[PDB]
Amino acid sequence: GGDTIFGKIIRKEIPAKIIFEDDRCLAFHDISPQAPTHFLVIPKKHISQISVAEDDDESLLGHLMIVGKKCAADLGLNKGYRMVVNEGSDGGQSVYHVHLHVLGGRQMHWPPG
Amino acid sequence: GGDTIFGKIIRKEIPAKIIFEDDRCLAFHDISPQAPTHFLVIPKKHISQISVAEDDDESLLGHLMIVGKKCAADLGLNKGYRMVVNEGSDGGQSVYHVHLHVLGGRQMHWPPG
Ligand SMILES: Nc1ncnc2c1ncn2[C@@H]1O[C@H](COP(=O)(O)CP(=O)(O)O)[C@@H](O)[C@H]1O
């Protein structure tokens, strides 16, 4: 689902510590975590960045989060966590396939970067 | 609606520089801005934290995101931005009512807190 490394991972072309999968997304642990628990929830539809998402991707986008809070519960993150979507340069996006970051396992700080 | 500060704002007790509103959500500038452009998007129905959210609130959550991107774009955050949702303790939540954070203007750093 796309011409980025997230696509290769979705296509099972390369490995990722896969956490959850359904027909429209895939959750896996970040290869370079910034917290004890750091995983990603990505959709299989190739949306490059959130600013490019359609009104018609609303449920899908909400699914990513739904999936996000579920998988967090199942990783023993009962004390809280932070969810992050980055858009472009200023935002710090590393891969141009939209995705949700879920980080837990320590105190997250303010500001959020 | 709500008991919280955000319930007070949904019910116009205290004003807010409203960027957007609809039947489902409300977007307003943050009074403790962490970047040049820093705004919040809360749903009008009371969900206090993301872990108590049902699969039913999926499109409403995708909607906060869709509106988030709309507003960032309407407030001209063309270089990028970052959306952050805070969960419980570890997440740094004090305001117990679901809310999407949108930050822009400056370069956002990694890790996100
Ligand atoms: N009257 C208000 N108008 C706009 N934003 C507000 C108001 N009161 C509180 N907020 C904002 O609520 C946001 C914080 O919510 P949380 O992320 O859940 C908790 P914390 O600030 O402890 O990290 C802050 O950015 C703060 O400025």
Curated annotation (Swiss-Prot), chains A, B:
EC category: hydrolase
Q: What is the effect of changing residue 97 to A?
A: No significant effect on affinity for 3-indolepropionic acyl-adenylate and tryptamine adenosine phosphoramidate monoester
Entry keyword Flavoprotein: no
Residue ranges spanning the membrane: these are: none
Position of the signal peptide: none
Tell me the outcome of changing residue 24 to P: In NMAN; negligible protein expression due to post-translational degradation; loss of homodimerization; significant decrease in adenosine 5'-monophosphoramidase activity; reduced SUMO-specific isopeptidase activity
Q: What is this protein called?
A: Adenosine 5'-monophosphoramidase HINT1
What is the originating organism of this protein? Homo sapiens (Human)
